[PDB]
Design a protein around this ligand. Structure first.
Ligand SMILES: [Zn+2]
Ligand SMILES: [Zn+2]
Ligand SMILES: [Zn+2]
Ligand SMILES: [Zn+2]
Ligand SMILES: [Zn+2]
Ligand SMILES: [Zn+2]
Ligand SMILES: [Zn+2]
Ligand SMILES: [Zn+2]
Length: 235
């Protein structure tokens, strides 16, 4: 996270690390003791045994508990437009919730759409400046100001990138806050009123000065609940 500050896992006990064998780090969020949600770009086409979930720690890779993935659920991820950029990971063993450092985050109401000028709380271990691709050892947090979807699309259209902006995402941060999703921050939870309203995307082709992009969880709540009910085949 660029332009945030050092946090603590007790401030965002839903946040987890998603370690992917020989691939980029991502963040994630606890939905239930058995399910974690992250970005699709993190785990698309990756075997579950190559994926670890790191929970209950402020640190990126150490001092918590690690649990292997069992199944990966992807629902029509389109890497070209980054449409439907979410994945649900089922753990091999249950996550030990403790209402201190490890807690589930509630899903939002159907089609929830954060209002422009409101703020979402985002937390993760991605890069903390735009020159470095190195991850943060410490959990960082920031409030990202929500940018109107149309206005964000118009901005992205300037560099012909408007294809990344659609109803299934919302935009937050950017020049107004000087606050951005960094490399490694894909999958980071975005929280509003004690519910998970967004899941961070990372668009490698995008420079700074544009708002960051977040999966609109509301748009996909039926899909998330279908996955959790066992009504969706794993990858
Ligand atoms: Zn589709
Ligand atoms: Zn499609
Ligand atoms: Zn449009
Ligand atoms: Zn539109
Ligand atoms: Zn639209
Ligand atoms: Zn600037
Ligand atoms: Zn759907
Ligand atoms: Zn869908």
């Amino acid at each position: 996270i660029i332009g945030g500050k050092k946090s603590d896992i007790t401030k965002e006990p839903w946040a987890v690390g998603v370690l992917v064998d020989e691939k980029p780090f991502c963040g994630g969020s606890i939905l239930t003791a058995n399910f974690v949600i992250t970005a699709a770009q993190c785990v698309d086409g990756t075997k579950p045994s190559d994926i670890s979930i790191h929970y209950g720690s402020s640190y990126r890779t150490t001092k918590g508990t690690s649990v292997m993935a069992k199944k990966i659920y992807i629902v029509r991820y389109h890497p070209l437009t980054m449409q439907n950029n979410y994945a649900v990971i089922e753990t091999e063993m249950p996550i030990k919730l403790d209402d201190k450092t490890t807690k589930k985050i509630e899903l939002p109401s159907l089609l929830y759409d954060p209002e422009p000028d409101t703020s979402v709380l985002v937390s993760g271990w991605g890069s903390t400046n735009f020159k470095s691709l190195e991850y943060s050892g410490d959990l960082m947090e920031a409030n990202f100001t929500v940018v109107d979807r149309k206005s964000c699309e118009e901005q992205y259209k300037q560099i012909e990138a408007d294809k990344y902006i659609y109803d299934g995402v919302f935009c937050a941060g950017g020049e107004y806050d000087e606050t951005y999703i960094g490399y490694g921050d894909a999958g980071d939870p975005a929280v509003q009123n004690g519910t998970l309203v967004g899941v961070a995307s990372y668009i490698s082709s995008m420079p700074s000065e544009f708002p960051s992009v977040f999966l609109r969880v509301g748009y996909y709540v039926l899909d998330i609940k279908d996955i959790i009910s066992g009504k969706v085949k794993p990858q």
